[PDB]
């Protein structure tokens, strides 16, 4: 029993964090094999600024050891610093681009040293509600599948509303954001419907069934209601993905949709679901199955 | 900006997790130097749990009855002893990944990270607190026994909890690393239940100060209170009594935000009376009590917004 916001074990990622300095800016880098990946803003016409830099300008620090930069190149908004030493702690890894609604673990770092780990989700507006202070740039987001680390996010900046923006590991931003000081803001956000449904199924698994009712709904009627509450539209793929949870608990996905419809129109009425007075949307259907089965890494 | 429930990086603890097997039972162990620490109930059957005589069960065991597995490598047990509710298995190999560590016993209201394991393999990490009733609201399934609770302030791991059992309400009970249980609990399948739980008042106050640091002051009022009048109100809402030590501990946060501890107590009194009225504080519709004053100073900026 118990349901918590759970992050992946961070150890395979801890062994990759380094500190990157160039002139006045100090931020974090990801050391994989003989290349260090970091945000290009550590150095705007980025190619004009980069052509003026020599390898010895970038000071790379791995623990107490200084690494020697032997080359440099830019890929989109990420800088790739070729170093003389291969990381002996390099894990089996991949660079993956995620979709909004998907979740991941964030290892927050300052000065190349990891300070904390938390779980979060890519919001439909392509921002993340993270916990970052100045010096956190270069912190990475990841998932683990058996022994392989899937790197999906690198932190670049904070928006005026306190939310965060960044790129995949190939330097492409999530969202209509750019890496410079300008007037930019997050768009209106929506609730991840498929995730709230998964979390209602997790509550049923943990013995919380007060919100269940005898009613069902059509997918079209549910989406007409959901659009009125700033909820993301629910697709047939979402319904198929919740299949296992629907068969395990005995509650059909459209049957659970009718419960969510009533929660949106009437509220919780002094009650909580899994210790929460709000409907939670940062657990995917796979996070629910993984936590209520015990998958190890 | 932002405020998340944040756990310590788990890597130093991952390198210590092993699998321990005794007959039909399999749970997790903590391998530090040449000793593996695990719950003593690994020697019990399900029947034994009603009234187990651990000393009688242990005297019948030899070193080769205990199978220890570190990854794909089998460790050889060369000795064994019991310290309270923990079993200490002397092994023939020191853990090369042993970090700088301490065994610390914590007080209720203290927070820590939990590395949940199954079969000596870590599956997840989450942050939690020792409740006033000495239980923890964790996320554990069968096979999680031996999972540990820890804090990593600076570069030293402070082990404070080892998981032993799930109580009937779904909450969890365990011991410090010296085998002494937190709470009036026993490693026995007895009629035992968690006492009535209360809210950690000093933690909710710290979290209200974190919200003020991040720019939210809607909940403040023009009133103050005496400590005695605050506690008379707090007791009525199942809140732990606030002591002079708690007031002293909130000093730094008070001086940083400019809000006196008894003035912040007045806002809490009002929040308990009125509720949130459709509003949230740091993305939460409930008053959060699993962030200590120390966690707030650690996670939040040194400059108020
Ligand atoms: C609060 O002000 C800002 O976030 C923006 N700034 C005015 S700044 O701090 O000077 N600024 C400019 C800027 C412009 C573009 C890019 Cl790609 C990055 C950056 C930086 C940035 O975003 N760094 C931060 C990241 N995460 C978290 C933060 C928390 C606090 C303060 C900087 C944080 C710095
Ligand atoms: C509803 O809870 C249960 O089913 C727990 N039990 C009644 S049990 O599984 O029969 N049980 C009794 C027992 C009594 C004392 C001690 Cl020290 C240990 C143990 C064991 C125990 O507690 N192991 C578990 C630990 N954490 C989490 C769990 C989750 C699920 C299932 C076992 C979990 C086994
Ligand atoms: Cl303590």
- We report the CATH number of the domain holding residue A96 as 2.40.10.10
> Are B72 and B106 within one domain?
no
Examine the fold and report which residue of B143, B165, B197 is the final residue of a domain before the chain moves on: B197
Catalytic residue of the set B22, B38, B145, B265: B145
B126 min Cα distance to partner chain A (Å) = 5
> Are B29 and B155 within one domain?
no
Nearest C-alpha to atom 1 of ligand 2 is from which residue?
Answer: B168
Pocket of ligand 1 (CB under 6 A): A 41, 132-134, 136-137, 156-158, 179-181; B 1
Instruction: Give the residue, out of A127, A158, A181, with the most ligand 1 atoms within 8 A of its beta carbon, to mutate for a pocket test.
Output: A158
| Helix locations, chain B, DSSP H | 11-14, 54-59, 201-213, 227-235, 244-249, 251-257, 261-274, 293-299
Nearest chain B residue to A280 by CA distance is B284
Q: Which residues pair with B252 in a beta bridge?
A: none
A141 min Cα distance to partner chain B (Å) = 13
- Give the Cα separation of A163 and B213 in Å (integer): 16
Ligand nearest to the CA of B160: 3
Nearest C-alpha to atom 5 of ligand 2 is from which residue?
Answer: B166
> Are B172 and B134 within one domain?
yes
Our CA angle for B205, B208, B210, nearest 5°, is 110
CA-based nearest residue to A134, from A160, A109, A117, A171: A109
Ligand nearest to the CA of B151: 3
- Give the Cα separation of A142 and A154 in Å (integer): 9
CB contact under 8 Å between B141 and A206, yes or no, is no
What is the number of the ligand 2 atom nearest to the C-alpha of B189?
14
Nearest C-alpha to atom 31 of ligand 2 is from which residue?
Answer: B142
Q: Does residue B279 sit at the A interface (CB-CB below 8 Å)?
A: no
CATH code, B249: 1.10.1840.10
Nearest C-alpha to atom 33 of ligand 2 is from which residue?
Answer: B142
CB B147 within 8 A of CB B116: yes
> Are A217 and A242 within one domain?
yes
> Are A278 and A168 within one domain?
no
Q: Resolution in angstroms, to 1 decimal, for this deposition?
A: 1.8
State which residues form the domain around B72: 15-99
In sequence order, the 6+-apart residues with CB closer than 8 A to the CB of B139 are A1, A2, A3, A4, A6, A291, B116, B124, B126
How far CA B113 is from CA of A10, A115, A282, B57, B209, in Å, comes to 12, 13, 20, 33, 22
> Are A255 and A110 within one domain?
no
> Are A2 and A141 within one domain?
yes
Dihedral over Cα of B271, B275, B277, B278: its sign: positive
Examine the fold and report which residue of B99, B131, B159 is the final residue of a domain before the chain moves on: B99
CB contact under 8 Å between B9 and A133, yes or no, is no
Contacts of B299 in chain A (CB under 8 A): 116, 131
Examine the fold and report which residue of B99, B118, B150 is the final residue of a domain before the chain moves on: B99
Nearest chain B residue to A133 by CA distance is B1
- Give the Cα separation of A281 and A5 in Å (integer): 11
> Are A118 and A77 within one domain?
no
> Are B270 and B211 within one domain?
yes
Q: Is B145 a catalytic residue?
A: yes
Contacts of A208 in chain B (CB under 8 A): none
Nearest C-alpha to atom 17 of ligand 2 is from which residue?
Answer: B187
CB contact under 8 Å between B121 and A297, yes or no, is yes
Nearest chain B residue to A12 by CA distance is B11
Our CA angle for A104, A110, A113, nearest 5°, is 85
Residue B263, Cβ density class (10 Å: 0-12 exposed, 13-18 middle, ≥19 buried): middle
What does the DSSP assignment read for A142-202? EEEETTEEEEEEEEEEE-TTS-EEEE-TTSPBSSS--SSSS---PPPP-B-HHHHHHHHHH
A290 min Cα distance to partner chain B (Å) = 9
Contacts of A189 in chain B (CB under 8 A): none
CB contact under 8 Å between B14 and A11, yes or no, is yes
Contacts of B286 in chain A (CB under 8 A): 272, 275-277
| Helix locations, A15-164, DSSP H | 46-51
- The residue count of chain A comes to 297
> Are A124 and A78 within one domain?
no
Pocket of ligand 2 (CB under 6 A): B 41, 49, 140-142, 144-145, 164-166, 187, 189
CB B161 within 8 A of CB B182: yes
Strands B156-166 and B101-103: parallel
A256: part of which helix (H) or strand (E)? helix A253-266
> Are B114 and B262 within one domain?
no
> Are B37 and B109 within one domain?
no
How far CA B132 is from CA of A155, A273, B190, B288, in Å, comes to 38, 22, 21, 14
- Give the Cα separation of A24 and B59 in Å (integer): 65
Number of domains in chain A: 3
CA-based nearest residue to B131, from B39, B55, B199: B199
CB contact under 8 Å between B6 and A107, yes or no, is no
- Give the Cα separation of B261 and B209 in Å (integer): 10
Q: Does residue A107 sit at the B interface (CB-CB below 8 Å)?
A: yes
The catalytic residues of A are 41, 137
Q: Does residue B143 sit at the A interface (CB-CB below 8 Å)?
A: yes
- Give the Cα separation of B6 and B122 in Å (integer): 18
A44 min Cα distance to partner chain B (Å) = 25
């Amino acid at each position: 029993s118990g349901f918590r916001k759970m992050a992946f074990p961070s150890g395979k990622v801890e062994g990759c964090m380094v500190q990157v300095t160039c002139g006045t800016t100090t931020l974090n880098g990801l050391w994989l094999d003989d290349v260090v990946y970091c945000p290009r803003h550590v150095i705007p016409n980025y190619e004009d600024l980069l052509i003026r830099k020599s390898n010895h300008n970038f000071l790379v620090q791995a623990g107490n050891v200084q690494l020697r930069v032997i080359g440099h190149s830019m890929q989109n908004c990420v800088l790739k610093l070729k170093v003389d030493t291969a990381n002996p702690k390099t894990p089996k890894y991949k660079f993956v681009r995620i979709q909004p609604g998907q979740t991941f673990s964030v290892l927050a770092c300052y000065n190349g040293s990891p300070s904390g780990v938390y779980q979060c989700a890519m919001r439909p507006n392509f921002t993340i509600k993270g916990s970052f202070l100045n010096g956190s740039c270069g912190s990475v987001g990841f998932n683990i599948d058996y022994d392989c680390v899937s790197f999906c996010y690198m932190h670049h900046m904070e928006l005026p509303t306190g939310v965060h923006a960044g790129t995949d590991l190939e330097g492409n931003f999530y969202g209509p954001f750019v890496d410079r000081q300008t007037a930019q803001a997050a768009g209106t956000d929506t609730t991840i419907t498929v995730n709230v449904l998964a979390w209602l199924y997790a509550a049923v698994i943990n013995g919380d069934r007060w919100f269940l009712n005898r009613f069902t709904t059509t997918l079209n009627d549910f989406n007409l209601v959901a659009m009125k509450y700033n909820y993301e539209p629910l697709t047939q793929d979402h319904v198929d993905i919740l299949g296992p949870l629907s068969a395990q608990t005995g509650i059909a996905v459209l049957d659970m949709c009718a419960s969510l419809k009533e929660l949106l129109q009437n509220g919780m009425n002094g009650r909580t679901i899994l210790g929460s007075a709000l409907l939670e949307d940062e657990f995917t259907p796979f996070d629910v199955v993984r936590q209520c089965s015990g998958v190890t890494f």
